Amino acid sequence: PIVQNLQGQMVHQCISPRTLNAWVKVVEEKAFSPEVIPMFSALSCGATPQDLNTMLNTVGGHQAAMQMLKETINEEAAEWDRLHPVHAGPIAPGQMREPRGSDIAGTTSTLQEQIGWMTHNPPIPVGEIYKRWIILGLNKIVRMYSPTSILDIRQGPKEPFRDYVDRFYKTLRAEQNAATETLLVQNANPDCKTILKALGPGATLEEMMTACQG
Amino acid sequence: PIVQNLQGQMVHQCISPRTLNAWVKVVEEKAFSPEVIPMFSALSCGATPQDLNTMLNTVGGHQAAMQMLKETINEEAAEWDRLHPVGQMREPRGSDIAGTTSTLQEQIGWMTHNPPIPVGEIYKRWIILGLNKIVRMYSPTSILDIRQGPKEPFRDYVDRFYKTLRAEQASQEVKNAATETLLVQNANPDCKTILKALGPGATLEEMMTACQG
């Protein structure tokens, strides 16, 4: 990534072995669970397009997800090309050439060019732009890998209320609304179904969970 | 986080993989035990609103608690706005402190300004408030139901007592009302007579020594 030294200048730094492994393990362990995305964004803090491609290429399996990711990138890169066409001619001294869609994806750009853009004044954040494309595609994958619908989440007979609310919002997060509030109350088990709504609408989840314990 | 470098300047740094992993494991292993909150505050030392959201978002399970946390944040953010209507710098809204409508540059701006608006610390204050509610909620037993077993060692009973008392918290007053009266009362008949004979002012050390047999 590109970090800040003691001098105060933005310098380039090799991606650490700890970061490389941390991203590999979280994919191996959590697959494409919703919480993988914030982990990816944090591990790729200040990352260059080259660094981002490294993290993506280090992924062994999940090649269906990677191919879907590639597409999302292609779409966003095409739109960038439309909104940022590069004019022909020579580059002025002390200036950087305008980056294409493939430049942001680190396909047609070198590391030194990426460093040049990111440490420019004012900076062209090709790293943050590319990651925005990647995160966009990653969200599509999370939604697809989502096993259950929110409509099929219902409390078991002897299942604790807390465990039911856990499964509810866990499922809701993966699929990415006021329809959520109504769905939660209705899909509660018989006993909690009655206790839940003597407090009426506008009641907090806290007030609901305390009322249906034990 | 925003830290002071070796040169002595307040700069921004990426949250470390070790910090990220530590917070995730603590939640996975300790759930919402009372000691999770001091751990959270320590791991989020000098954190920006962006960093705080990163830590919260990295949490896989416990979405009921996370939702409760969102509600608490919404309350505190709304209460912040009611107390703050509108070359002078724009003061943050409730959504800015939560990092929702504010960028990292703006977050760094408020924190490194003179005078600084500790949006990081203000946000963390809201989160810890929310975490306190969850800890109190995930508390298995009431303090009133903590009673010494007939064959239970006094030390083990005191452990369960102050563990429950910590999770419950109080208003400081209820804590003081229970720590002396409730603790001695809910002890078994043998220890209860001894402790009540020791009278008030007896240290826990003195109490545990007398009932150690």
Binding site: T180 | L56, N57, Q67, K70, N74, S95, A98, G99
Partner: peptide
Amino acid sequence: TPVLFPGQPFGQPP
């Protein structure tokens, strides 16, 4: 008016 919405991440812009 409310900052955070159910099912959506922390620090999610409106």
